[PDB]
Amino acid sequence: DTEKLIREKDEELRRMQEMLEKMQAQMQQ
Amino acid sequence: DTEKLIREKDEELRRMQEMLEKMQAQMQ
Ligand SMILES: [Zn+2]
Ligand SMILES: [Zn+2]
Ligand SMILES: [Zn+2]
Ligand SMILES: [Zn+2]
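Above: inputs. Below: predicted complex with zinc ion.
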């Protein structure tokens, strides 16, 4: 399914952005 | 205690490095 494929990939990208965000914060505080 | 502190900070960087590697591999 094409909408499901876009959605699953987009969520994975969102989860990775959040991880990077949490990592950068750890190297600050 | 300085050696213990260095290892604990190293463990945290390794965990971040390892998650970074999973992201790059995952984006294949
Ligand atoms: Zn469809
Ligand atoms: Zn997106
Ligand atoms: Zn889900
Ligand atoms: Zn966020």
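Chain A has one domain: 1-29.
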